[PDB]
Amino acid sequence: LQSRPEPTAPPEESFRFGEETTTPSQKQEPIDKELYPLASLRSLFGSDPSSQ
Incomplete structure (x- = not known):
């Protein structure tokens, strides 16, 4: 109900x-099994505020 977009x-x-x-x-x-290494290394490049 906010006119302002909140990331929260x-x-x-x-x-x-x-x-x-x-x-x-x-x-x-x-994409999950065969490219598992790629999916796994994503957590080395990606980082969400409310996450790791």
Whole structure:
């Protein structure tokens, strides 16, 4: 209900809009296993405020 966009989003949006993030289509898993090393090293380049 704020006209200003806040990075502090209530967790309700992760549940409400969690419908889009769950995809039964790509359930075959496009990128995860074979490119696991690449996925793993992502945590060396990426860093979210409320995360590691």
